[PDB]
C-alpha cells in the first residue's frame, strides 16, 4: 500500500534543567574515564 508516514508526520508536528543534568552526567562520566 501507499506509505504516508511522512504526511502523518507533517500533521503530527502541529535548554532544560533535565537536559543540563543529563549533560553533567555525560561530562562526569567522560571526565572520570578519559586520560
Amino acid at each position: 500500500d501507499i506509505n504516508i508516514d511522512d504526511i502523518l508526520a507533517e500533521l503530527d508536528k502541529e535548554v532544560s534543567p533535565q537536559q543540563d543534568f543529563s549533560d553533567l552526567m555525560k561530562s562526569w562520566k567522560n571526565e572520570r574515564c578519559s586520560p
Binding site: 500500500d1 504516508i4 504526511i7 507533517e10 500533521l11 503530527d12
Partner: protein, 424 residues
C-alpha cells in the same frame, strides 16, 4: 436450578483455605480470616495518604461488604445484621438488623454519602440514610449485585421469572433521579476444571466485578471475561453497552497465542481507558491474600479476527489495517464518553479537554491510515466515505495529499468539495 448467593464486588471464595476477600475496588480491599469460631476482618486502602487501614474481630461473620471513600458497609447475609463504619470515626459506627423471611438472605449492599442500600433475595430494597434512619422500602426483582459511586447507584437484578436486568439511579442530596429501571442487561451468564465450579458455587451469576469508570459510567465484567461499559447512559433513548475489552483475546494476544490458559483477569476499576486488575495465575481464578500489584490493561475494541492473526503470526503483531480499525473505534467511543462527561459533569482534574483534543488527533490519524489503504485499493467511494469521518479540517487536507500520491483526482476533487463545505 438456581440459588441466590451474597455478592460483593470482586470478592473471592474461601476455596481450600481459611481466608478470603470480601471486596476490592478503586478505593481498597477488605479481607476476612476464619479465626476459629470468629472472623478477623482487615480493611486496606490503596491511597494511604487519605485513609488508614484498620481491623477488628467479627463475631457475626460478615460475608457482605462494600467500600467507598466515606465508610465501610458490612452485612451478614443469613441473619440480616448490617453494620456501617465511617472512616473518620468522628461519626459513629452503627448496627442494624433488617427483617428476613425464612430462607431469605441479603444478596448485596452498597453505600453513598447520604444513603445505605440493602437488597435481599426476595427483592426487597431497603434504604437508610447514612446515620441508619430507615427512609424507604421498595420491592424489585432480586438484587443479585449492587454498587455505587458518589451519588450514582447501579444495581443488577435476576430471577427465573424476570431474567437478567439492571437499574441506574442518581439519588443525590436532592433531585433524586432514576435513569433506567430494570432494563435487560446484555451480559452472558456462566455455562452449567473444578475451580470454576467452586467459583460459581460462590457466585452463580459469574459477575467478577461491577463498578463505575472514574468519569462515572457504569461497568460490568461477566463470565465471558468481557468488560462492558454503558455509553450515553445520561440520556436513556441513546444508551448502549459497548464491549470495550475482550480480556480473553487480549490475554491470548499479549502472550503470543499458544492456547494460553491458567492466567485470569480479576477486574478492579477502569479509570480513564485502562483496566486496573490482578492477573491471577494458576488453577484458581481469584487472587490470594498477599494481593498482587494490580496490573494495567488498556481497553481494546474487539475487531481482532483470531484466525487472521494466526495466519499472520503462525509476540503477536497486528496488521496495520486491523490496528487502524481498532484505533478509530476506540478513539471515537472514548471521545464520545469524554464529551458527554464534560458536557454534563464538567472537568475534575482540569486537563480532560487537552486529553480529548489529543484523542481527536489519534482519531483523525487512524482515519487517514485507513484512507491510505482504501486509496491503495483505488476505491474512490470507500476513500470518500472515510474522508467524511474526519473532524479536523486541517487533517482533511492530508487526505488531499494522500489522494494525490494515490493518483485519484476524482478523490481530490470530492475532498475539495468537502473542504469548501467544512469551511462553513
Amino acid at each position: 436450578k438456581f440459588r441466590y448467593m451474597p455478592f460483593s464486588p470482586a470478592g473471592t471464595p474461601f476455596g481450600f483455605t481459611d481466608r478470603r476477600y470480601l471486596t476490592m475496588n478503586e478505593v481498597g480491599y477488605v479481607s476476612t480470616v476464619k479465626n476459629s469460631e470468629q472472623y478477623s476482618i482487615t480493611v486496606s486502602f490503596f491511597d494511604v495518604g487519605r485513609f488508614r487501614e484498620y481491623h477488628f474481630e467479627d463475631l457475626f461473620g460478615y460475608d457482605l461488604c462494600f467500600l467507598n471513600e466515606k465508610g465501610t458497609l458490612f452485612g451478614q447475609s443469613k441473619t440480616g445484621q448490617i453494620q456501617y463504619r465511617p472512616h473518620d470515626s468522628i461519626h459513629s459506627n452503627w448496627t442494624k438488623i433488617i427483617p428476613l423471611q425464612a430462607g431469605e438472605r441479603i444478596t448485596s449492599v452498597a453505600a453513598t454519602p447520604v444513603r445505605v442500600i440493602v437488597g435481599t433475595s426476595l427483592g426487597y430494597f431497603r434504604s437508610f440514610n447514612q446515620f441508619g434512619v430507615p427512609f424507604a422500602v421498595e420491592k424489585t426483582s432480586p438484587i443479585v449485585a449492587l454498587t455505587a459511586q458518589n451519588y450514582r447507584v447501579f444495581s443488577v437484578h435476576y430471577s427465573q421469572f424476570h431474567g437478567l436486568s439492571y437499574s441506574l439511579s442518581e439519588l443525590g442530596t436532592s433531585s433524586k433521579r432514576y435513569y433506567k429501571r430494570e432494563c435487560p442487561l446484555p451480559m452472558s451468564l456462566p455455562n452449567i476444571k473444578d475451580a470454576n465450579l467452586d467459583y460459581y458455587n460462590f457466585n452463580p451469576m459469574g459477575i467478577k466485578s461491577l463498578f463505575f469508570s472514574s468519569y462515572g459510567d457504569p461497568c460490568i465484567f461477566g463470565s465471558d471475561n468481557t468488560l462492558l461499559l454503558l455509553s450515553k447512559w445520561r440520556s436513556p433513548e441513546e444508551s448502549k453497552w459497548l464491549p470495550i475489552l475482550d480480556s480473553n483475546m487480549e490475554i491470548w494476544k499479549m502472550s503470543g497465542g499458544k492456547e494460553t490458559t491458567d492466567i485470569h483477569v480479576w477486574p478492579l476499576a477502569l479509570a480513564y481507558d485502562t483496566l486496573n486488575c490482578i492477573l491471577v495465575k494458576g488453577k484458581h481464578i481469584w487472587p490470594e491474600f498477599p494481593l498482587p500489584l494490580p496490573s494495567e490493561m488498556e481497553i481494546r475494541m474487539p475487531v481482532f479476527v483470531k484466525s487472521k492473526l494466526l495466519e499472520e503470526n503462525k509476540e503477536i503483531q497486528i496488521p496495520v489495517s486491523m490496528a487502524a480499525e481498532e484505533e478509530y473505534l476506540r478513539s471515537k467511543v472514548l471521545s464520545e464518553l469524554l464529551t458527554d462527561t464534560l458536557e454534563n459533569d464538567g472537568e475534575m482534574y482540569g486537563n480532560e479537554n487537552e486529553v480529548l483534543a489529543a484523542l481527536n488527533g489519534a482519531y483523525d490519524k487512524a482515519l487517514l491510515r485507513l484512507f491510505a489503504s482504501a486509496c491503495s485499493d483505488q476505491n474512490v467511494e470507500k476513500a470518500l466515505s472515510l474522508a467524511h469521518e474526519l473532524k479536523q479540517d486541517r487533517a482533511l487536507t492530508a487526505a488531499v495529499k494522500i489522494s494525490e500520491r494515490a493518483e485519484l483526482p476524482s478523490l481530490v476533487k470530492k475532498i475539495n468539495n468537502i473542504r469548501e463545505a467544512r469551511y462553513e
